[PDB]
Amino acid sequence: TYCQVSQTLSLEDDPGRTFNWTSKAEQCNPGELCQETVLLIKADGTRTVVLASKSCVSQGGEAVTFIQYTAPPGLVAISYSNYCNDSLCNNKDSLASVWGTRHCPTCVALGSCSSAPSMPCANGTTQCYQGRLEFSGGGMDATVQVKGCTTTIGCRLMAMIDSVGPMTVKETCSYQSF
Ligand SMILES: *[C@@H]1O[C@H](CO[C@@H]2O[C@@H](C)[C@@H](O)[C@@H](O)[C@@H]2O)[C@@H](O[C@@H]2O[C@H](CO)[C@@H](O)[C@H](O)[C@H]2NC(C)=O)[C@H](O)[C@H]1NC(C)=O
Ligand SMILES: *[C@@H]1O[C@H](CO[C@@H]2O[C@@H](C)[C@@H](O)[C@@H](O)[C@@H]2O)[C@@H](O)[C@H](O)[C@H]1NC(C)=O
C-alpha cells in the first residue's frame, strides 16, 4: 500500500549510466499495487528521450515486461515495466539493465525538434521516418517527435503496441521506403 511515485520526461546523454529513478514513497488506496515503467527513444547520434513513471495502480498483474519495439541501426525504442504487489517494490534506481547510400533528417525531442540534420543510413535501414508519438495517462501526457533512418516499416516505431504500463501511445508518421 506504499509505492514510489514520480512522472519525469527528459533528454538524456547516457541514461544507462546517469539516470537516478529512486523516487519518494506515497500511500496508495487499498487494493492497489506499484508499477515502474520507463520508455527510452533514440535516433542515430541523438540524445535519448526518457518517459519514466512510478505510481500506485489498480489494474494489472505482477509481470515484468522488457520490449524492444524497434531495433538499431537508426531509431531505437525500448521499455521496461515492472508491476509488483508489495510496499516499495517499484524501487529500481538505475536503467543500466534496461538500455549509393541513403540520408534522412534525424532528430528526437519532447515536443518538436529544433532541427533535423541529414545523416547517412546504415546497411539494414528500410526507410526515412518522420513521426510523432502521443502519450496519455499516468500523469505522463507528452509528444515526442522522431526522425531518422530506421529498420521499422511504415509508421511502426512503436511496433503497433497501444500501451506501455500506465501510458497509452498513438503513432502518426511519414516514411519514404528504399
Ligand atoms: C495484491 O495483493 C492484495 C492483498 O493480498 C494480501 O497480501 C498479499 C501479500 C498476500 O499475502 C495475499 O494473500 C493477501 O490477500 C490482493 O488482494 C486479495 O486477493 C484475494 C484473492 O483474489 C482476495 O479474495 C482477497 O480478499 C484480496 N484482499 C483485498 C485487500 O482486496 C490483490 O488481489 C493482489 N493483486 C495482485 C495483482 O497480486
Ligand atoms: C539517487 O537518489 C537517492 C536519494 O534521493 C533523493 O531522494 C529521492 C527520493 C529524490 O526525490 C531526490 O530528489 C532526492 O535528492 C540516493 O540515496 C541514491 O543513492 C541515488 N542513487 C545513486 C546511484 O546515486
UniProtKB/Swiss-Prot annotation:
Its main location: membrane. Residues 104-178 form the UPAR/Ly6 domain. N-glycosylated; by high mannose and/or biantennary complex and/or certain types of hybrid oligosaccharides; possesses different oligosaccharides chains according to its subcellular localization in the testis. Sheds from membrane raft by ACE and released from the cell surface of epididymal sperm while it passes through the caput epididymis leading to disappearance of TEX101 on spermatozoa; is essential to produce fertile spermatozoa. One of its GO terms (cellular component) is extracellular region. Glycans are attached at N20, N85, N123. One of its GO terms (biological process) is flagellated sperm motility. Disruption phenotype: Knockout Tex101 mice are viable and show no overt developmental abnormalities. Males are infertile. It comes from the Eukaryota. Detected in testis and ovary. Expressed in spermatocytes, spermatids and testicular spermatozoa, but not in spermatogonia or interstitial cells. Expressed abundantly in testicular germ cells (TGCs) but mostly disappeared from epididymal spermatozoa. It is a lipid-anchor; GPI-anchor. It is found in: Cell membrane; Membrane raft; Cytoplasmic vesicle, Secretory vesicle, Acrosome; Secreted. Plays a role in fertilization by controlling binding of sperm to zona pellucida and migration of spermatozoa into the oviduct probably through molecule adhesion ADAM3. May play a role in signal transduction and promote protein tyrosine phosphorylation. This is Testis-expressed protein 101. It comes from Mus musculus (Mouse). The chain holds residues 26 to 215 of 250 of the full protein.
